[PDB]
Structures are given as structure tokens and as C-alpha cells.
PDB file of C-alpha atoms and ligand atoms in Angstrom:
ATOM      1  CA  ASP A   1     -11.024 -30.739  -3.093  1.00  0.00           C
ATOM      2  CA  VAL A   2     -14.295 -29.741  -4.680  1.00  0.00           C
ATOM      3  CA  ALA A   3     -15.968 -26.388  -4.845  1.00  0.00           C
ATOM      4  CA  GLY A   4     -18.630 -26.206  -2.122  1.00  0.00           C
ATOM      5  CA  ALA A   5     -16.377 -28.119   0.312  1.00  0.00           C
ATOM      6  CA  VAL A   6     -14.188 -27.041   3.190  1.00  0.00           C
ATOM      7  CA  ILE A   7     -10.663 -28.347   3.514  1.00  0.00           C
ATOM      8  CA  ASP A   8      -7.928 -28.046   6.120  1.00  0.00           C
ATOM      9  CA  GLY A   9      -6.614 -24.494   5.750  1.00  0.00           C
ATOM     10  CA  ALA A  10      -2.993 -25.560   5.333  1.00  0.00           C
ATOM     11  CA  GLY A  11      -4.051 -27.639   2.301  1.00  0.00           C
ATOM     12  CA  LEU A  12      -5.172 -24.600   0.314  1.00  0.00           C
ATOM     13  CA  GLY A  13      -2.918 -23.717  -2.570  1.00  0.00           C
ATOM     14  CA  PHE A  14      -2.815 -23.004  -6.275  1.00  0.00           C
ATOM     15  CA  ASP A  15      -2.944 -26.759  -7.116  1.00  0.00           C
ATOM     16  CA  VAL A  16      -6.303 -27.147  -5.357  1.00  0.00           C
ATOM     17  CA  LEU A  17      -7.659 -24.082  -7.114  1.00  0.00           C
ATOM     18  CA  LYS A  18      -6.518 -25.378 -10.560  1.00  0.00           C
ATOM     19  CA  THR A  19      -8.380 -28.623  -9.792  1.00  0.00           C
ATOM     20  CA  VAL A  20     -11.475 -26.580  -9.099  1.00  0.00           C
ATOM     21  CA  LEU A  21     -11.015 -24.665 -12.382  1.00  0.00           C
ATOM     22  CA  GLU A  22     -10.479 -27.941 -14.257  1.00  0.00           C
ATOM     23  CA  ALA A  23     -13.812 -29.384 -12.994  1.00  0.00           C
ATOM     24  CA  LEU A  24     -15.732 -26.502 -14.681  1.00  0.00           C
ATOM     25  CA  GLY A  25     -14.633 -27.730 -18.098  1.00  0.00           C
ATOM     26  CA  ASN A  26     -13.418 -25.649 -21.000  1.00  0.00           C
ATOM     27  CA  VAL A  27     -15.584 -22.526 -20.642  1.00  0.00           C
ATOM     28  CA  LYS A  28     -14.065 -19.201 -21.581  1.00  0.00           C
ATOM     29  CA  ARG A  29     -14.198 -17.263 -18.266  1.00  0.00           C
ATOM     30  CA  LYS A  30     -14.166 -18.944 -14.855  1.00  0.00           C
ATOM     31  CA  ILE A  31     -12.784 -18.513 -11.339  1.00  0.00           C
ATOM     32  CA  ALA A  32     -11.767 -20.815  -8.497  1.00  0.00           C
ATOM     33  CA  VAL A  33     -11.833 -19.102  -5.110  1.00  0.00           C
ATOM     34  CA  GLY A  34     -10.192 -20.415  -1.908  1.00  0.00           C
ATOM     35  CA  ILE A  35     -10.458 -18.544   1.375  1.00  0.00           C
ATOM     36  CA  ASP A  36      -8.468 -19.813   4.387  1.00  0.00           C
ATOM     37  CA  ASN A  37     -10.129 -18.880   7.683  1.00  0.00           C
ATOM     38  CA  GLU A  38      -7.404 -18.413  10.309  1.00  0.00           C
ATOM     39  CA  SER A  39      -9.433 -15.592  11.934  1.00  0.00           C
ATOM     40  CA  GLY A  40     -10.260 -17.368  15.210  1.00  0.00           C
ATOM     41  CA  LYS A  41     -13.982 -16.980  14.348  1.00  0.00           C
ATOM     42  CA  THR A  42     -16.500 -19.290  12.626  1.00  0.00           C
ATOM     43  CA  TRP A  43     -17.885 -18.045   9.348  1.00  0.00           C
ATOM     44  CA  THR A  44     -21.403 -18.645   8.102  1.00  0.00           C
ATOM     45  CA  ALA A  45     -22.330 -18.135   4.460  1.00  0.00           C
ATOM     46  CA  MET A  46     -24.661 -15.258   3.699  1.00  0.00           C
ATOM     47  CA  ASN A  47     -24.823 -14.992  -0.077  1.00  0.00           C
ATOM     48  CA  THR A  48     -23.006 -14.294  -3.366  1.00  0.00           C
ATOM     49  CA  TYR A  49     -24.011 -11.348  -5.501  1.00  0.00           C
ATOM     50  CA  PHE A  50     -23.201 -11.717  -9.215  1.00  0.00           C
ATOM     51  CA  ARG A  51     -22.819  -8.617 -11.382  1.00  0.00           C
ATOM     52  CA  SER A  52     -22.297 -11.107 -14.180  1.00  0.00           C
ATOM     53  CA  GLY A  53     -21.923 -14.816 -14.310  1.00  0.00           C
ATOM     54  CA  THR A  54     -23.115 -17.671 -12.230  1.00  0.00           C
ATOM     55  CA  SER A  55     -22.226 -20.485  -9.921  1.00  0.00           C
ATOM     56  CA  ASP A  56     -23.881 -23.896  -9.573  1.00  0.00           C
ATOM     57  CA  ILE A  57     -22.178 -24.294  -6.177  1.00  0.00           C
ATOM     58  CA  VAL A  58     -23.698 -23.571  -2.770  1.00  0.00           C
ATOM     59  CA  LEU A  59     -21.276 -21.450  -0.679  1.00  0.00           C
ATOM     60  CA  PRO A  60     -19.718 -23.679   2.054  1.00  0.00           C
ATOM     61  CA  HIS A  61     -22.224 -23.016   4.782  1.00  0.00           C
ATOM     62  CA  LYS A  62     -19.941 -23.214   7.856  1.00  0.00           C
ATOM     63  CA  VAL A  63     -16.222 -22.455   7.808  1.00  0.00           C
ATOM     64  CA  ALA A  64     -14.457 -22.994  11.090  1.00  0.00           C
ATOM     65  CA  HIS A  65     -11.178 -21.513  12.112  1.00  0.00           C
ATOM     66  CA  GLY A  66      -8.466 -23.617  10.529  1.00  0.00           C
ATOM     67  CA  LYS A  67     -10.536 -24.439   7.478  1.00  0.00           C
ATOM     68  CA  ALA A  68     -10.497 -23.105   3.912  1.00  0.00           C
ATOM     69  CA  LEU A  69     -13.630 -22.846   1.801  1.00  0.00           C
ATOM     70  CA  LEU A  70     -13.634 -23.655  -1.921  1.00  0.00           C
ATOM     71  CA  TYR A  71     -15.925 -21.943  -4.409  1.00  0.00           C
ATOM     72  CA  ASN A  72     -16.273 -21.219  -8.089  1.00  0.00           C
ATOM     73  CA  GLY A  73     -17.954 -19.150 -10.717  1.00  0.00           C
ATOM     74  CA  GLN A  74     -18.206 -18.983 -14.468  1.00  0.00           C
ATOM     75  CA  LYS A  75     -19.459 -16.621 -17.158  1.00  0.00           C
ATOM     76  CA  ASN A  76     -23.113 -16.847 -18.179  1.00  0.00           C
ATOM     77  CA  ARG A  77     -23.288 -19.637 -20.771  1.00  0.00           C
ATOM     78  CA  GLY A  78     -23.871 -18.811 -24.403  1.00  0.00           C
ATOM     79  CA  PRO A  79     -23.063 -15.956 -26.860  1.00  0.00           C
ATOM     80  CA  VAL A  80     -22.709 -13.222 -24.261  1.00  0.00           C
ATOM     81  CA  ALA A  81     -19.360 -11.441 -24.191  1.00  0.00           C
ATOM     82  CA  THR A  82     -19.199 -11.098 -20.403  1.00  0.00           C
ATOM     83  CA  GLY A  83     -17.032 -12.442 -17.617  1.00  0.00           C
ATOM     84  CA  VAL A  84     -17.566 -13.429 -14.021  1.00  0.00           C
ATOM     85  CA  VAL A  85     -17.857 -10.714 -11.423  1.00  0.00           C
ATOM     86  CA  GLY A  86     -19.293 -10.867  -7.945  1.00  0.00           C
ATOM     87  CA  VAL A  87     -19.097 -10.491  -4.211  1.00  0.00           C
ATOM     88  CA  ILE A  88     -19.121 -13.203  -1.541  1.00  0.00           C
ATOM     89  CA  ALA A  89     -20.360 -12.386   1.977  1.00  0.00           C
ATOM     90  CA  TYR A  90     -19.823 -14.443   5.077  1.00  0.00           C
ATOM     91  CA  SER A  91     -21.061 -13.514   8.532  1.00  0.00           C
ATOM     92  CA  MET A  92     -18.440 -13.946  11.246  1.00  0.00           C
ATOM     93  CA  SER A  93     -19.256 -15.059  14.796  1.00  0.00           C
ATOM     94  CA  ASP A  94     -18.134 -11.621  16.119  1.00  0.00           C
ATOM     95  CA  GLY A  95     -21.158  -9.951  14.460  1.00  0.00           C
ATOM     96  CA  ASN A  96     -19.337  -8.564  11.412  1.00  0.00           C
ATOM     97  CA  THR A  97     -19.209  -9.518   7.723  1.00  0.00           C
ATOM     98  CA  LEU A  98     -16.322 -10.703   5.580  1.00  0.00           C
ATOM     99  CA  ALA A  99     -16.756  -9.591   1.968  1.00  0.00           C
ATOM    100  CA  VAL A 100     -14.729 -10.710  -1.064  1.00  0.00           C
ATOM    101  CA  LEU A 101     -14.894  -9.124  -4.532  1.00  0.00           C
ATOM    102  CA  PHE A 102     -13.771 -10.953  -7.658  1.00  0.00           C
ATOM    103  CA  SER A 103     -13.812  -9.510 -11.164  1.00  0.00           C
ATOM    104  CA  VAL A 104     -12.778 -11.441 -14.279  1.00  0.00           C
ATOM    105  CA  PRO A 105     -13.677  -9.511 -17.435  1.00  0.00           C
ATOM    106  CA  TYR A 106     -14.410 -10.689 -20.951  1.00  0.00           C
ATOM    107  CA  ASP A 107     -12.141  -8.312 -22.864  1.00  0.00           C
ATOM    108  CA  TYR A 108      -8.496  -8.227 -21.804  1.00  0.00           C
ATOM    109  CA  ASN A 109      -7.691  -5.639 -24.446  1.00  0.00           C
ATOM    110  CA  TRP A 110      -9.468  -3.143 -22.297  1.00  0.00           C
ATOM    111  CA  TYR A 111     -10.020  -4.579 -18.771  1.00  0.00           C
ATOM    112  CA  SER A 112      -8.078  -6.603 -16.161  1.00  0.00           C
ATOM    113  CA  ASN A 113      -8.732  -8.948 -13.239  1.00  0.00           C
ATOM    114  CA  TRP A 114      -9.388  -7.399  -9.798  1.00  0.00           C
ATOM    115  CA  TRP A 115     -10.236  -8.619  -6.301  1.00  0.00           C
ATOM    116  CA  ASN A 116     -10.807  -7.164  -2.867  1.00  0.00           C
ATOM    117  CA  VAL A 117     -11.435  -8.106   0.728  1.00  0.00           C
ATOM    118  CA  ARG A 118     -13.102  -6.061   3.455  1.00  0.00           C
ATOM    119  CA  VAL A 119     -14.685  -6.513   6.870  1.00  0.00           C
ATOM    120  CA  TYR A 120     -18.055  -4.652   7.306  1.00  0.00           C
ATOM    121  CA  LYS A 121     -19.540  -3.793  10.621  1.00  0.00           C
ATOM    122  CA  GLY A 122     -22.688  -5.848  11.228  1.00  0.00           C
ATOM    123  CA  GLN A 123     -24.368  -8.467   9.100  1.00  0.00           C
ATOM    124  CA  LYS A 124     -24.435  -7.171   5.491  1.00  0.00           C
ATOM    125  CA  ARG A 125     -25.553  -9.163   2.470  1.00  0.00           C
ATOM    126  CA  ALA A 126     -23.604  -8.908  -0.730  1.00  0.00           C
ATOM    127  CA  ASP A 127     -25.412  -6.717  -3.299  1.00  0.00           C
ATOM    128  CA  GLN A 128     -24.815  -4.210  -6.112  1.00  0.00           C
ATOM    129  CA  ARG A 129     -24.106  -1.454  -3.589  1.00  0.00           C
ATOM    130  CA  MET A 130     -21.397  -3.587  -1.969  1.00  0.00           C
ATOM    131  CA  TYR A 131     -19.908  -4.377  -5.408  1.00  0.00           C
ATOM    132  CA  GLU A 132     -19.722  -0.624  -6.132  1.00  0.00           C
ATOM    133  CA  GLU A 133     -18.049   0.098  -2.786  1.00  0.00           C
ATOM    134  CA  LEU A 134     -15.461  -2.716  -3.175  1.00  0.00           C
ATOM    135  CA  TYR A 135     -14.678  -1.993  -6.802  1.00  0.00           C
ATOM    136  CA  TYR A 136     -14.840   1.809  -7.061  1.00  0.00           C
ATOM    137  CA  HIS A 137     -14.050   3.055  -3.511  1.00  0.00           C
ATOM    138  CA  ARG A 138     -12.108   0.575  -1.383  1.00  0.00           C
ATOM    139  CA  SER A 139      -8.884   0.152  -3.374  1.00  0.00           C
ATOM    140  CA  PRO A 140      -9.194  -3.249  -5.040  1.00  0.00           C
ATOM    141  CA  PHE A 141      -6.100  -5.265  -5.840  1.00  0.00           C
ATOM    142  CA  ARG A 142      -5.098  -6.173  -9.355  1.00  0.00           C
ATOM    143  CA  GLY A 143      -5.070  -9.847 -10.379  1.00  0.00           C
ATOM    144  CA  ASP A 144      -1.452  -9.241 -11.380  1.00  0.00           C
ATOM    145  CA  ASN A 145       0.200 -12.540 -10.457  1.00  0.00           C
ATOM    146  CA  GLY A 146       1.416 -11.229  -7.158  1.00  0.00           C
ATOM    147  CA  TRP A 147       0.548 -11.257  -3.450  1.00  0.00           C
ATOM    148  CA  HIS A 148      -1.177  -8.331  -1.747  1.00  0.00           C
ATOM    149  CA  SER A 149      -1.744  -7.833   1.967  1.00  0.00           C
ATOM    150  CA  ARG A 150      -3.798  -5.374   3.993  1.00  0.00           C
ATOM    151  CA  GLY A 151      -4.991  -4.880   7.551  1.00  0.00           C
ATOM    152  CA  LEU A 152      -8.759  -5.353   7.756  1.00  0.00           C
ATOM    153  CA  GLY A 153      -9.368  -3.799  11.163  1.00  0.00           C
ATOM    154  CA  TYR A 154     -11.250  -5.922  13.741  1.00  0.00           C
ATOM    155  CA  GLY A 155      -7.987  -7.646  14.697  1.00  0.00           C
ATOM    156  CA  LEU A 156      -7.639  -9.198  11.239  1.00  0.00           C
ATOM    157  CA  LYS A 157      -5.528  -9.025   8.161  1.00  0.00           C
ATOM    158  CA  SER A 158      -5.748 -10.414   4.650  1.00  0.00           C
ATOM    159  CA  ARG A 159      -3.185 -11.757   2.197  1.00  0.00           C
ATOM    160  CA  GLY A 160      -4.182 -12.887  -1.291  1.00  0.00           C
ATOM    161  CA  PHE A 161      -3.099 -13.751  -4.812  1.00  0.00           C
ATOM    162  CA  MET A 162      -4.914 -13.683  -8.098  1.00  0.00           C
ATOM    163  CA  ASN A 163      -3.549 -14.452 -11.530  1.00  0.00           C
ATOM    164  CA  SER A 164      -4.181 -12.303 -14.566  1.00  0.00           C
ATOM    165  CA  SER A 165      -5.928 -14.585 -17.040  1.00  0.00           C
ATOM    166  CA  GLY A 166      -9.556 -15.497 -17.800  1.00  0.00           C
ATOM    167  CA  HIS A 167      -9.206 -18.834 -15.953  1.00  0.00           C
ATOM    168  CA  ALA A 168      -8.643 -17.185 -12.639  1.00  0.00           C
ATOM    169  CA  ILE A 169      -7.412 -18.503  -9.316  1.00  0.00           C
ATOM    170  CA  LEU A 170      -7.979 -16.375  -6.170  1.00  0.00           C
ATOM    171  CA  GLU A 171      -6.276 -17.570  -2.993  1.00  0.00           C
ATOM    172  CA  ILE A 172      -6.986 -15.540   0.159  1.00  0.00           C
ATOM    173  CA  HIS A 173      -5.819 -16.041   3.789  1.00  0.00           C
ATOM    174  CA  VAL A 174      -7.544 -14.224   6.634  1.00  0.00           C
ATOM    175  CA  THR A 175      -5.370 -14.178   9.783  1.00  0.00           C
ATOM    176  CA  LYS A 176      -5.115 -12.467  13.107  1.00  0.00           C
ATOM    177  CA  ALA A 177      -3.316  -9.139  12.848  1.00  0.00           C
TER     178      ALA A 177
HETATM  179 CL1  LIG B 201      -9.955  -2.940 -15.619  1.00  0.00          CL
END
């Protein structure tokens, strides 16, 4: 149960994600991400785009059906009042791309946690343009301590949960629709 590993999909839960958060140590803004692949396709890591922040973890390179990937991110170290915000992209064996936005801000007086999930047609790397699409145009979900579901198209659907604080857990399940 370390970031950068894959685990059995059924093993993914908030406990595993707190373990991942705990291993980052007591930094101010951090995220543990778990994505359960029940899509019937194999996923291959493409890249992570960071608007702000960093990860020392290599995306789990291959995520088979029935496995969950674990990942993390943290704010840039030092006296910078910024959070951790980015987009993960995995290529799926059907030729399309699974994209996941996460956004954990610095200042909770003014901003909140958000996430999103989308399938793109073709093989599309995560980048600033994708961040802008997922954040400003494709109806992101609040990290509001509740579950949110949506159909993804392509025979898939998503269900996920993110909490509201600056030590964020993001648990996502991708299933057949
Ligand atoms: Cl906000």
C-alpha cells in the first residue's frame, strides 16, 4: 500500500489512502489518489501535469482490470502559498484516454477542493489545456465529503469521493456502465 504501486481493486479504500498521506509526512498540502480500474481494459500511464505542486512518485505504469493504482502529490516545498493541482492521464487499451483532475488549494478562506474524471477520444497527454477543460468547462465535482457519479461514455462510468481538507484523499472507481 504505497504510492506508485498497484493493489487489488477491492482493497482500495479511505484507510489505504490515509496511509499514503501519512507517508508524505507533515507537509501542509498533500493528496493521496486511488483509482480502481474495473473498466475491462488495461491502463498505461501517460503523464501527470502539475499546475502547482509535485510528486516524487512514478505513476503506476500498468494498471490491469481489477487493480487499483495508488499515487500522491504535495505542494511545492518552501515558503510558497500554493497547493497541489494537476491532471493524471492514462491511455486505455481501447485507444482512448482516462483523465483525472485534482485541485487542493492553499487558501480555504477563498477556495475549495475539486476533482474531475473524463474519457477523451484518442491518446491525449495531460497538459495545461486539459486542466482548463476539466476545471472550467467539464463540471468538476467538489471535494465535499460526498460521493459523486457520472457516466463517462465509452461504456464506462465513474464514482468518486474527495474530502474537503488540505490533506486530501481522492478515491475513484471506474466501472462498466
Ligand atoms: Cl474554489
